[model samples]
Target chain A: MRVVVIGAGVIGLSTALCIHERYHSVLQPLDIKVYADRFTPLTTTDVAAGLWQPYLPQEADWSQQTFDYLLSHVHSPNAENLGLFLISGYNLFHEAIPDPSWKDTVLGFRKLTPRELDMFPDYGYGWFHTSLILEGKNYLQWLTERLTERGVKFFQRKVESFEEVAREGADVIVNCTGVWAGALQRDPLLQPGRGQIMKVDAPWMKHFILTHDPERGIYNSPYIIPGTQTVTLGGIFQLGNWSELNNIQDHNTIWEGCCRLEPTLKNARIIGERTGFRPVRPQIRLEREQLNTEVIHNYGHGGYGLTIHWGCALEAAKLFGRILEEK
Target chain B: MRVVVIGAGVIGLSTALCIHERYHSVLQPLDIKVYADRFTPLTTTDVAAGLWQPYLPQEADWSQQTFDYLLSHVHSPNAENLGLFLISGYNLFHEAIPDPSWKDTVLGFRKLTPRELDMFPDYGYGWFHTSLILEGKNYLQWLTERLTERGVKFFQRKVESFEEVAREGADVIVNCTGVWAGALQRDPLLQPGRGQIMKVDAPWMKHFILTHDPERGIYNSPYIIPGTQTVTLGGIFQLGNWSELNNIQDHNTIWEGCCRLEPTLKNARIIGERTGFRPVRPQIRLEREQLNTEVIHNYGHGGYGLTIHWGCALEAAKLFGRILEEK
Candidate 1:
C-alpha cells in the first residue's frame, strides 16, 4: 500500500495524510514520499486564509471530504495534545445570503438578528456562528511533524509529470499541484488567480466578516483565529491575473477600506501585507484518472482548498480504497 | 524656473510637473532634472491604481491645491493628448457605511440602488462614479516625454541623501520619495508597509470595487480600467514587513476571492503576482525642513501618495517659495 503524493499543497498533503492514517500498519512495510517544488511558508497553502467556507464551480468531492476529516480532529486528543484549540468563529453575511449548501456538513451554523445586523450594517443581513480556521503558520508545521512521525518521507523536487514519479516506483501518485498544475501538468484550465491581504495584530477581535462589493467583484472579511499573533485581513480576488507586485494605490485602498469596517481596528497594529495566487479551475478534478499509472487527480480547489480540504481528501481516499480493494 | 525631478513615482515627477506647470515662465534658467529608478512597467507607479483620494491622518494644503490643479486638467485637451482621462469614480464610504465625505470634491456622487448593490455585495452601501485614474503605463511615459520636450534633464540615479543631489548643484531640493522616504531620509516615524497584487488580463471587467475587512485589516478590490486590456488584482498591506518574496498562500486567497467576485474570471489568463512596500507614516509630511547645506524637507504621503500627489507637491512648492522669500 505504498503511495506517493505529487504535491505539498493542502490537497496533496491531506491526501498523503489520509492514506497514512488509513493504512498505517501495512504501508509501514515500504516508503511514502511527498514531492514538491517548495515547502511551507513558500507553498500556496501558507498564503491561504484557510477558511471553512465552500467554493463555487466544484472541484473534487474529496476537497469537502478532506475538510471534514481534518476538522473532525479539531477536538481529538491528538490535536489537543498538539495545543490545537478548537476556536469557534462566525461568518457575518448581508442580504439574503443563502445558507451554505453544505451547512449540514460543517460544524456550528446560525443566523444573526437585526441587532447583530446593526454591528455589521455595511451588509444588510448577518449570519453568526462558529467554524474551523486552520492557521497555516502553526498548523502546517504541526501537520508536517505529525506526518513525519508517521514515517512519511518528504522529497524536494520540481516534478515534471506523473511519469517521472511513476517510473520511480510510485505505485500510487496523487496530483495536488494547485495553480501550478497549469504549467506542471499542462492543464490549460488551471491558472493563477491573484490575491492580496493584510495581516494585523488585533487580539481583541473574534469572528469573521464577509463584506461584499457586487459591482467590482470585491469582498472584504476579517478573521480572528486562535493561536496566531496577527489577524488575517483579506482580501481581493482577481482571477486569471498574475502580476506578483504590490502597488501603492491598492495599498491605500486596502487601508482605507479596512479602516471603514472596524473603526476600533484603526487602532489595530500594522503587521504585514501578503499576496498570493490560488489555483483556479472550472471543476475541481478529484477522480482517479489513469495518467499512465494509478494517478489520483486532486487539484483546483481555488480559495476553498482549506475549507474543504479534508472533505476532498476523504473522497480521494475512498477512490484510493477502491484501488486497494482491487488488489 | 526649471527643475530636474529624479523619480517618476507619485512624488518626484509630480513635483517636477507641478513646478513646471505653475511657474511656467518664472525662470528660463529652470531645468527639472528627472531621474527614474525604473521606467513605465518597471516603475512602482505602474503597479498602483492611481485613485484620487486623500488620507485621514495626513492633511496637505498642497494636496488640496494639487487636486484642484489636476482636476482642472481632467477636461483639458492635453488630458487626452497627454493620455490622461478624468473619469467619474468614487471612494464610497469611510469608517462606516456612510456617504463618501468627498462628495463635494469628487464629481457625480450618488448612492447605489439595491439593483446596483447586487454587483458587489461585498461592500456595504455604495457611492457610484469615477475618479482620475492615471494609467501609469501611458501617463508616466507621456509625462517623461512632456518633461523631456520641455527640456527637463532626466537622470537615473539611486539617491542616497539630500547631500548627494545638493552636491550636484540642486539649489532647493524637493524630496518626493514616497515609500523610500524612511530609508533615504531616515525619518523615524516613516516605515515600509508592503503590498502585493496580481495583474491579469480580464477585459470583461469594467468598474473598480474597494472593500474593507476589519478583523484582519484586509481590503479587497479589483481594478478593471476602461479601455485597458489588463486588470489589476490586488492584495494586502504588511507594515514594517520587508520581504520581497511572493507568498503562494496569499495568491490562493486572492485568486479565490477574486473569482468569487466574478466567476467568469476564473479561467482568465494570469499575468503574474507583484509586491511593493509602501512607505507609510502616521501623517503625510508636506513641509520644508533644512538638512545640512541643502534645504530639503519631505512629504510622506503613505498610501495616498498617488491620490494626493500633485496637491502635496503644490504645498512643497509653496514652502520652496517661502524659503526663497526669506532668503
Candidate 2:
C-alpha cells in the first residue's frame, strides 16, 4: 500500500507517524510519502507554543491520549533537544462556568482558593493544572527527523486539490493542510483565524498563565506560555480574519495585557513577531472524502491542533485499517 | 605566523579575507582562526542591508574602492547568490550645504530638478546616485563560505580581551569586535546607536529612498533599501541607547513615514522587525594598539561598515605587510 500525507504541520506528521507504527503488519509492503509546500520553521505550528489544554467542547479522551504521547518524550534523553518540559499554571476566568472537559485529564487539577484569586482582581474564579508543553519548532524538527528515520519520504511540493493527489496513485491521502484546506476543498465552513505571538527573552518566568474570556472572542490577548528558548506572549484569535500580517493595534493589546499579568515583560526584549492563520472550523473533519480515491481529512484543529494531534492521528490510522480490510 | 580575528561580522571576515590574500609572500605558512560567540543570522550585519554610500566625514577613496570591489561582483554568475545588484536612487536632505564628498565617486550623479522634487513636498535638496546593494544575510553566508575554502579555521568561542589571545601565542590579534570594542577596550568614545528596521513585502518597489536629517538625530525613521528577498523599510539611529528591544513608537514612525513616500507600501505585508546596535564613534579606529602584542583595532565603522568594509580590510592587510617588512 502507498500512502501520501498531504500536509506537514503537526497533524500531517502525527498521522504519518501512526501509519508508520501500525501498518507494518507482516504483509505490509507500504510506501509512505509526505507532500507539503512548507515544513518546520515556516509552518504556523512553529509560531505557537504547544499546550495540552483541551478546548471548550473537545474530545477529552483525545486530549488525554495526546498528553500521554507528549509526556512519554519528556524524560527521554532527547527531551532537551525536543524542548519538552512539564509546567503547571493557572487558568483564570472572568465568569464562573462548568468544570472544563480537561479537568480530570491533567495532573493535580484543582480550584484556586478565593484569596489565591486576589492576585488577579478582575477574575472571579481560577483553576490550576500541571501539564506538558513543547516548543513547536523543536517538536516539528524531532517529528520530521523521526519520520525520516522511519522511511517516510518528504516532498516539498504543493498539491492544488485532493483530485491532484488522487491521480498520483496514492492509495490513501491524508489532508492536513491547516488553513490551506479551505481553498483546496473550497471549504466554506473553514475560516482562517489569525493568531499573532511574540517571543520574548524572560528567564525569570517559569510558569504559564492564561486569561480566558471566549464570549468577547479575543480579550485573551496576553496568554503567557514558557517554552525552552523564550517565553511566548500571545495571542489574539480573530475568527474569519484572513490577515497574516503584524498589526500594531494587536501589538499594543498583547503588550499591555501581558505586562499587566507579568510586569517584568515591560523589560522583555522581543526576539521576534510571528503571525499564523489558524484553521478554524466548528468541528474537525476526520472522515474520508467521497472522491474516487481514499482521502482522509484531518484538518481544522484550530488553536488546539497540538493538544489532540496524536489522538486524532491514531484514529486516522484505525480508519486506514478498515479501508485495508474492506479491500 | 599565527593570526586571530576576534569577530565574525563583515569587518572580521573582510579583515581575514584581506589577510589571506596579502600574507602569502615567501614566509606565508600562516594559520588564521576566527573566534566569535555569534556568526551570520545572529550578527547585526545580517540584520542590515549593504548600501554603498560615503558617510559625511568618510574617506571618499575608501568608499570608491569598496564600490569598485562590489561592482566587480555584479554581472558575475555568483551575483544572484551573493545578492549583489546595482540600483539608482535619490537621497533627500532637509538642509543641504557642501557638494557631498562622494559627488564624483558615484555613477550618473545628478541633482534633482526643482520640479522633480515636487513628489516629496518637504525636502529642499536631493541628488541621485547609482550604487550597489546587498542582502546582508546572503552576503555573510557567501563570505563565510569563501573564507572557509581559503584555509581559515572558525571556532565558536568568545575571547575576554587582547591579553587573553596574546598569552595564547597568537603572533597578531585583530580586534574587529564591532560594538563590543567599547566594553573590551573600555573606550569611553564608543556609543551604541540602536537601529531598528522592518522588512516588508513590497515587490513593486525597485528604487531606494533616503530622507536625511542631522540635527534632530533620528527622523531618518523610514529609509527604503530594496534587497533580494524583500524591500527593507527602516531605520532609526538612537545614539547612546544600549537597549535592543523592538519599540512600538519606532514602528509607527517607520510605517507612517514610508507610507507617505510610497503610498503602495500601506498595503505591504510586514515580514519581520529587527533591531541592531550600531557601534557609534566619532571616527573609525584603524591604528595599532600599544599593547605588548601586535593588536590592530579595526572597528567603529558604525552604520557604514558594509560601505567601506573591503577598503578598510585592504588597508589593514597593508598594515600587516608593513609589520612584516620591519621584521
Candidate 3:
C-alpha cells in the first residue's frame, strides 16, 4: 500500500509512523511519503511547549489514550532517547473549580493544602499532578529520523488540495495538516488559535506553574513548564487571531504575571520566543472520507496536539486498516 | 505646520517626538501625527533585545551620538522613566582581535581578567564595557506615552505611497518605515536580516555575556543580556532569510551553546520567543528627498535601530528644519 501524509507536523508524522508500524506485515508492503511546505523548525508543532495536559474537555478519552502511550514510552528502555520526561506542576485558579476530567488518570494528583494555597494569595484553589512534557525540537527530530530509518520518504512541498495527493500515486491519503486543513479541505470548522511562548534559562524552577481563572475559561492562564534544558513560559490563547508576530504587550503580561507568582523569575535569562497557531475546532476530526482517494482526516487537536497526538494517530491507523479491508 | 510620520516603530516615534520638540515654536505650530500598520507590541522594535552595541562599522558616528544621548538620559533624574540603564557585560571572542572602533567611546572600557576569561575556556580574547540596554517593551511604551502626552497623534494605517502622505495635508513627511521602506518605495537596496531571541527568567545573572568568533564577524554569536525584568538571550543573524517562524535546530544550537557557556542557564525559565527582521542596507539612510512631498528618510539602521535611534532621529529632525527654511 502507498500512503501519502499531507503534513510533517506532530499529527501527520505520528499518524504516518503508526500506520507504517501497524500495517507492515507479510502480506502488506507499505510506502509512506510525508509532504509538507515546512518541516520541524517552521511547523506549529515546533512552537508548542508540549505539556501533556489536555486543553479540550470534550476529548478527554483521546488525551487519556495519549497519556498511556507516552507513559509506556517513559518506561521503555529508550525513554531518554525518546525525549520524554516526567514532570510535576500545579494548576492554580483564582476561584474554586472542579477537578479536571483526567485528573484521576494522572499520577500523584492531589489538591493543595490551605497553607500551600496561601503562597499565592490571589489564587483560591489549586491542584498538583505529575505529567509528561515533550520537548518538540528533540522529539520531532527523533520522529523524523526514526521514520526515515524505517524506509519512509519525506518531501518538502505544499499540498494545496486532495487532488494533488491523488495525482501523486497515493492509494491512501492521510490529512493531518493541522491549521492548514482550513485551506486544504476548505474546513470551515478549523480556526487558528494563535499562541506565543518564551523559552528561558530558569534552572532554579523545578516544577511548572499554571494559573487559571475558572470564569474566563483557559484562555488567560499563565504557565511555566520546565523541560530538560529550558523552561517554557506562556502565553496568550487568542482565538481567530492569525498573527504570526510576537506581541510585545503580551510578552510583558506573561513576564509580569509569572514574576508576580515567583518574584525570583525576574532574573531568568530569556533565550528564544516563538509564535504558532493551533488548529482549533469544536471537536477533533478523526473520520475517514473520500476525496478522489481514500482519506483519513486526523487534525484539529488545537493546543492539545501533543497531548492527543498518539490517540488520534492510533484511531487514524485503525480507520486506515478498516478502509483497506473494505477495499 | 502639520507633519506626519509614516511609522510607529522606534524610529518613527522617536523622529515624531524629536520633530515636535525641536520645531514647536510659536511661529511654527507643529502638529505631529504618527501612523503605522502596527504599534508597540507588534512592531519590530518590540522584538529587539536592544543592547547598545553598534553593528554597522560605517555608521560608528551615529551610534556614538546615540551612545552620548543615552548616557545623558542615564544620568538624568528620570533615567528609570526613560527606560535606560547602565549595564556592564563581556564580549567574548575565539581568537585575538583588534579593538572595536568605538571601544574607546563606550564607558569604562577594559580588558577582562585572566580569571574572568577562564570562565569561558573556549574564548581567547574578551572585552568588558559598561553600556546601555534598552528594554523595548518598556522603552517603546514609554516613548509612545510620552509622545502622546506631548500632543503627538498616533494613527494605525498603512501608507502605500508618498502620495498618501501628501493627501493627508502635511507640509512635511518623515519616512521612518524601517523594513517596510522597501515595499513602500520599492527600494531594491533594503533587505531583511532575520533575528530570533528568547526572553527568559534568570534572576541569578547580573551582567551580560556575549560570544563571538572574531574571524567570522558578529553574525552567529550567542549573547545573554540581563534586563530589569527579564534576561535576553540571543541569537542567530541570518541575512536575506525572510523566515518568520522560529527554527527548531537553531533553538537547539542556542540552548546547547548558551548552556555550554553558562550551565546554570539550563534551568532558566523561557518566558517568550520573538522573530524580527532588521532593515539591512549598505548604509543607514538619513537623507531628505522629494516624492510628491518633502520627506526625510531615516531607516536601514539594521540591528542597530535602538543603538542609533536617537542620533538618527536628531539628524532627521535637523533635516526637517532645513526643509522648512527652504520652503
Candidate 4:
C-alpha cells in the first residue's frame, strides 16, 4: 500500500512511523513518503523546549500514553542516542492552586514545604515533579535516521492541496501539516499560538524552574528547561498572532525573569533564539475524510503536540486500518 | 525651590534632566531628586531597541524636535561616548506603501531599486532611511552620570501615590513614571504594549533590516537594530499583554526571521534577551494638575519613549514654568 504523510513536523513523522510499524506484518512492504515544506531548525517541533507536560487537560490520556512510551525508551539501551532523558522542575505559583492533573502519573510529585517556599518569597506555593525531556535537535535527527533506515522516503516540497497528493499516486494520505493544514483543509477552527524561546549555555543549572501566576494563567510562568547541552528559557503564548518576528523587549523580559528565579543564570551565555506557532484547534483532529483517496486527518495538537505525538499517531494508525477495512 | 521627580524610566530621567538644564539659571542651583523602584537593566528604558522612528503619527512634532536634538549631539565632541550614532536600514513591505510620515525630516530617505528589492523576494518594496540609533546601556549610564555631576539626586524607592510625593515637602512634582503613572494617577486610557528583543554579536553586519507585512501593521515587522557593541533583533507589539515571561516559541520565531533576512547571522552569537512594556496612551500627556504641590504629568510615549524623550521632556519643563508662574 502506498501512504504519504503531509508534514515533516513531529506529528507527521510519528504518524508515518506508526503506520509503517503496524502495517509491515500485513503487507510484504509498505511505501511511505513524508512531504514537507521545511524541516528541522524551522519547524514548530524544532522550536519546542520539549517539556513533557500536557498543555491541555482534555488530552491527558494521550499524554499519559506518550509518557509511558518515552519512559520505556529512556530505559532502553539507546536512550542517550535517542536524546531521551529525565528532568525535574518546579511549577510555582503565587496563589494557592490545585496540583497538576497528571500529578499521580508523574514521579517525584509533591508540594513544597514552608522552608522551600521561603526561598522564593515571590511564590506562595509550588510542586516539584520529575518528567521526561525530549531534546529536539538530537531527537529529531535520531528519528529521521531511524525512519530512513527503515525504508521511508522523505520529500522536501510544499503540498498545496489534497489534489496534489492524489496526483502523486498516494492511495492513502495522512494530513498532519500543522498550522498550514488550516490553509490546505480550509479549516477556520485552526489558529496560531505564537511562542518564543532562548537557548543558553548554563550546564550548572541542573533543575528546571517553571513558575506561573495563578491569576494570569500560563503567561506568568517563564520556564527554564535544562537539556543535554543547553538550557531553554521561554516564553509567551500569543493566540492568533501569526508574526514570527523576535522582539528585544520580550528577550529582556525572559532574561530578567529567568535571572530573578536563578541569579547564577545571569552568567549564562546565550546561544540562540527560536519561535514557533502552535497549530491550535478547539479539539485534536483524528478523523478521516474521503476525497480522491482515503485521507486521514491528524493535526492540531497545539502546544501539546510533542507530549501526545506517539499516542495520537498510534490512534491515527488504527483509524487508517478501519478505513482500509471499510473499502 | 525643591523639585521631585517620580519614576526613573526614560521619561522620568529625561524630564528631570531637562528641568535642571532649563531652570538651573532661573533658580540658582535647583534641587532635583529622581525616585524610582528600579533603575536601568530593570526599567523599560533599558529594554528599548533604541530605534529613532516615532511610533505614533500624532506625535510627529515631538519626534522631529527630538530627532534634531539627537542629530546635533551626533555632531558634537563626545558623540560616541554618549551612545549617539547614525544607522541606515530598510522598512520592507509585501506591497507598495507610502514613505514614513517623517520621511522629510530623516536623512537618506529613498526607495529601493529593483535589483535591491530582488535580494529579498519575500518583500515587494522598501524605504531606505538613515536615522539615529541610541545604545540604551551607554546612553542611560551617561545620562545618570551627567545628572549626578550636576547635583541631581537619585533615590531608589517606589512612589505609591501622588500623595507620597507631596509629603516629601516638594514645591513642584513631575510625574514621568511611564506605565506606573497609570496606577498612580488612575488614568483609564493608559495600557501596556509588550515587546521582545535579543542582543547578538554580529559586527560584520553593517546596515539594519526591518520588515513587516503591510497587511499586518507593526506587529508583523521584525527589526534588526545595530549598535556599537552588538546588534538588536526584535520584536512583537502585543497590546494589553502584561506578562513579562520569556517565551521559547517567540525566541525561535525571532531567530528564524532574522536568519532569513541575513543568512550570515546564523553564525552570530547571541548575547542576551530583553523584554519591556511600552506605556501606551491615547495621546501624549503634558498637563499640570493642582494638588498639595504643583504637579506636571508627562508619561505615555509608548514605543516612542526613547524616540521622543527629549522633546517630551522639553515640553514638560515648559509646563513646570507655567505652573510655577500660576502660584
Candidate 5:
C-alpha cells in the first residue's frame, strides 16, 4: 500500500501515523508520504492550545480512544526517554453552565469551591482537573523522528490537485488538508475560526479555566500547561473572521483581563503572543471517496482535531486495512 | 511660545494640537518641534486598535479623565472629519468581574440574550456593546497633515537623551516617549510588553471581541477597524520580552487562530507580521523634574497613554505653560 497524506497539521500527522502503525508490518511493501505547505510551528498544531477538551463535534468516543492511545505512548518508556509526560490537567467551566463534553473523561475533574470561584469571578462556576496538552514544538520533532525511522517520506511541495498526488504514484491518498479544504473543493460548511493565544513563562500555573461570558461567546479560561520552560497562555475564539493582523488594543484588553482573573499572572513573565485560525467545519470529516484513486477523507476536526485525531485515525486505518486484505 | 513635542504618538500629536488650539494665541511665538524615530505605520499608534475605552487603572482618575476627553474629541466635528467614531462593542468577562467603572458613561451598554448567548456558549455569559474605535492609521496621517499645515516643525531624528534636545536650545521639552520611557531613563518599572500583530487584507470586519483564559492568561482577539487597504488582525501581548526576531512558530499559531475565527479569512491575503514592545509601567508618570538649565521630566503613560494622552498632555501643558508664562 502506497499511501499519501495531504497536510501536516495535527490531523494529517496523526492520520499518517495511524495508517503507518497499522499497515507497516503486514502491508509488506508500503510507501507513505506526507504533504504540507509548511511543517511544525508553521502548521496549525503550533498555534493550538492542545487542550484535550473537545469544543465542537460533542462526541468524545473517538477523542477518548485517541487520548488513551497517546497517553499510553506518552507514558511509555519511549516517551519518557523523549522527555515527554502525559501532563494531567483539567478544564474548569462555569458552575452554572454544563461542563464541556470531555469533562468527565479527563483525568482530574472537580468543582471550583466558592472561594476558588472568588479568585475568578468571571465565571459563575468552574472545574478543576487535569487532561493532556500536547506540546507540538517538542511533540512534532518526536513524531517526525518516529515516522522517519519507520520509512515514511515527507514532501514539502504544495499540491494543486488530487491528480498531483496520483501522478506521484500514490495508490491511496488521505485528504487531511485542514482549512485548505475550503479552497480544495468548496465545502460551503467549511469555515475558519480565528483564535489568538499568548505564550508566556507561567510555570507555576497548573489548571485550565473554561468559562462563558454573559455577552462574549465560548471562552476557555487562560490555562498554564507546563512545558520545557514556558507555559501556554491563551486565547480567544473569534468565528467567521480572517484578518491575521495584531492590534495593540486587543493585546492590552487580553493582558489586563488575564492579570485580573489570575493576579499571579501579574507575576508571570510574558514571552509573546501567537495567533492562528482553526480550520473549522460542521462535522469532523471522516470517510473514503474514490476520485481517480482511493482518497480517504480525514480532515476538519476544527479545534478538537488534536483531541480526537488518533481515534479517527484508527477508524481510518481499520477501513484501509480491510481494503488491503481484500486486495 | 515655541513648544516642541518630542514624539508623534497620539499623546504627542494631541498635545501639539491642544496647545495649538488653546495657547496658539498667547504662546504664538515659534514652531512646535515634534521629533519621532519613525512616522505613521511604523509608530506604535499605527499598530494600536485606537480604542477610546479606558482599561481601568489602579486609580480611576487617570482613565476617567482620559475617557471623557477622548469622548469629547471623538464627538468633535474636527474628530469626525478625521474619521474617529464612537463605536459600540462589549467586553465579556468571567470570575468576579468588576463592573467597568465607566459603564454609565459609555453608550450602547447591554447584556446578551440566551440565543445570543448560544453564539459564544464557550464564554458562558458576557457583557455586550461597543465603544469608540479610533482609526489610528487615518487619524495619524490626518493629524500629520494638519500639523504640517499649522507650522509644527517635524524632524525625524533618534534623540539619545534630553541633553540632545537641550543642546538644540529646546527651552521646555515635552517628552511623549510611549514605551521608550524605560530606555530613556533608569526606571526599572518601565518594562516591555512585547506585542506581535498581523496586518492582512480583510475590510468586512468591524467589531471587536475580547476574551480571557486563566491558563494561557489572556487571548488577543481579531480587531477590525476601517483603515488602509489591509485589515489589521491581531495580536499577542508578551511582557518583558525583548527579542525583535519574528518566530515562525508564533506566526503559524497566529495565522491558524485568525483563519479559524473567520472562514472568509482563508480567502483574504496575508501580508506580514509585526512585533513591538509597549513601554509598560505601574503608574502614569507625568511630572517635571528639573535637569540642569533645561527642566525635563515628561514621560510615562504605559499602554493607555494613547487613550489618556491628550488629557495628560493638557495637564502636562499646564505645568509646561506655567514655565513658559514665567519665562
Candidate 6:
C-alpha cells in the first residue's frame, strides 16, 4: 500500500509520523511519501516558536497528546540541538476568563498570585504554566531527519491538486496544505490568518511572558518565549489577511508590545523577523475528504498547529487505518 | 516552453535559475518547474564548504565564472546571514606544485612567505587566496525564495523517469539528479563519492589553514575553513563508496589531522558533523540525452558542484535555449 502526504509543515509531518508509527512496523507495511514545495526553515511551522496552547477550545485531548509527545525528548542528547526544552512562563490577561483546557498537560499549571499579577499591572488575571518550545528550524530539521530515517520519502514538489496525486498512483492522499488548502479545493471556510513574529538575542532571558487583553485573541497579546539560542518575541494575528509583507505597523505592534510586557526586552538585540499565514477555519478540519482515492483532510489549525498536530495526526491515522482495511 | 528540473541541489536550482533567465521575463515566458526528492540543508550542497576549485581540470573558465558570480554577493546587507563572506586562506603542500589555474579570479593570489610556510614545519610550498563560504541552509533558502518570488514553480515530487515528466506536460526536462541520476537509466559512468565533515565553534579563528601532501588528493589534507557561525574541518573522499554514516575512524583521522595542522582546533568546541555523497564522474556531465522529449543533463560534479554550478547552468540554459528554438 502507498500513502502520499501533501504537505511538509507540522501537520503533514505529524500525520506521516503517526501513520508510519501505526502502519509501517506492525499494522501493515506501506510507503508514506511526503510532497511539498516548502520544508523545514522555509515553512510557516519554522516561523512558529512552538509554544503549545490549544487554540481550538474543544480539542483538549488532541492538544494534550501532542504536548506529551514533544516533551518526551527534552532530555535526550540531541534535545539541545533540537531545542526541545521546558520553559516555565506566565500568560497575563487584562480580563478574567476561564482557565485553559490544556492546563493539566503542562507542568506547574496554576493561577497567578495577586502579587504576581501586580507585577504586570494589568486589569486582572491569567495563569502560569510550563510548556514545550520547539525552535522552528532545528525542530523541523530533526523531524525531517527522523522521518527520512524511518523510510518516509520526501519530494520537494508542489501538488496542483489532491486529485493530481490520486491519479498519479497515490492510493491515499493526506491533505495538510494549511492555508493553501483553498488552492486545491474551493472551500469558503479556509481563511488566511497572517502573523508577524520577531526573534531577539537575549541568552539571559530564561522564561516566557505573555500579555493579552482577553477575548481569547492572541493578536491583542505579545508573547516572549526563549529558545536554545535566542529569545523570540511575537506576535500579531490578522484574520483574513493574506499579505506576506512585514508591515512596519505589525512590527511596531509586536516590538513595542513585547517591550511593554517585559521591560528587559529593551536591552535585547534584535535578531530577525518572519511572517506566515495561519489556516483559519470555523473548526480545525480533521476528517475524510469526499474522494474515491482515500483522501484525508487534516488542516485548518488557525495558530495551534504545534499544540494539536500529533494528536490530530493520530486521529487522521485512524482514518487512514480504516481506509487501509477497507481497501 | 515548460521546463522541468529533476534535481534540487545546486545543479538543479542553477539549471532552473539559468533557464528562467532565458525563458521567463525576456525572450519568452514559460513555466519553469523544479521537482526533487530533497532540497537544501538536506542536500549534499549544504554540506559543501563552497570553496571554488575546478575538479574537472579542463573546466577552468567555468570555475572562474562561478567564482565571480558568488563573489558578487559578498558586501550585501544579507551577505552575513547567507554566510557569503571572504576568508583569506593558505593551501600548504608538502611538495611543490604549479599555481592554481583560476588564480586571477581571487584577491591577492600570492605565494606564501618562507616564514609563513614555517608555521607548519612539514610544508615546503604553498599559496594564499580569498574565497567565499555560503552557509548552506541560508543560501539555498535564499535561492528557493528568490525563485519562488520570481514566479518559478516548485514541486516536491520524485520523478521516477524523465519520460514521466515529459509526458505530463513538461515541454523540456533538465536532468540534474547528481549521484541519483542513475535511477533514470543504467549509466555505469556515475559513481558515489562519500565525504565526512564536521563544524566547530571558533569565532576568533579568522583565517583558514589547509595542510596537503604532494598529491592533489585533498584527503591527504585537513581543510579548516571558517563559516559564519563556526569553523568547518573536513574531509575524505571515498570513491564508489556509498556509506552515509559518521565513521569513527574518519572522525579520528580528521580530528587528528586538523589538530596537528592547526593545534588550536583542539580547543574549538566541536559543534556538529555531516556526511554526504558527492556525485562522481570522469567528466561532469553537461550534455543532452537522445529522447523524444528535450532533456538537458547536468550532474556528476564529484565535489565541485559549487565551484562550477553557475557556469554549467548557463551552458545547460544555452542547450535549453537551442532546444526551445528547435521545438
User: By TM-score, who's the top model here?
Assistant: 6
DockQ of 6: 0.06
Off by over 4 Å in 1: A56-71, A76-94, A106-108, A218-227, B1-327
What TM-score does model 2 score on chain A? Answer: 0.95
Residue-level lDDT tens digits of model 3 in A207-310: 98888774545556678888877888885888888766555667887788788887878999876677788888988998988875798898898888899888
lDDT of 5 by residue, B147-177 (tens): 7678777766777887777777777677778
Report the C-alpha lDDT of model 3 over B232-252, residue by residue, as the tens digit: 777677888766555556777
* Alpha-carbon runs more than 4 Å astray in model 5: A56-58, A80-95, A99-103, A219-226, B1-327
lDDT digits (tens) for residues A125-244 of candidate 4? 788889988866556666776787778877667788888889879899999888878778788899988888888999988888888764445543578889887899985777888755
Winner on lDDT between 1 and 2 is: 2
Query: Which digits, one per residue and each the tens of the lDDT, describe model 1 over residues A121-192?
Result: 576765565666676544566667677778787766787877778887777888888887766567877777
Residue-wise C-alpha lDDT for candidate 5, range A1-327, written one tens digit per residue: 678898877777777887888777886788898877666556777676666777624347898896787677765766633334545533444436666676667676776677876665556666676676666655665677678778787766678988877887888888888877766666888777777667677877665554445356554334445565576666466777664433344566667766776678887766555656777787877887787578888877777777787788888887788668657
User: What are the TM-scores, per candidate, against the unseen true structure?
Assistant: 0.49, 0.54, 0.63, 0.52, 0.50, 0.64
RMSD in Å for all candidates: 21.0, 25.7, 7.6, 15.2, 22.9, 9.0
TM-score of 1: 0.49
Q: Looking at model 6 chain A, which ten-residue stretch has the lowest summed lDDT?
A: A211-220
- Residue B85 lDDT, candidate 1, scale 0-100: 60
Residue-wise lDDT of candidate 4 within B129-225, one digit each (tens)? Answer: 8988886656776777678778887765777887777886888888888877877878889988887788899998778888877454664466788
TM-score-based ranking: 6, 3, 2, 4, 5, 1
Predictions ranked by lDDT, top down? 2, 3, 4, 6, 5, 1
Q: What is the alpha-carbon interface RMSD for each candidate?
A: 10.0, 16.6, 7.4, 16.5, 11.6, 10.2
Error of 2 at B95 (Å): 3.3
After superposing candidate 4 on the true structure, give the runs of residues whose Cα lies further than 4 Å from its correct spot. A56-58, B1-327
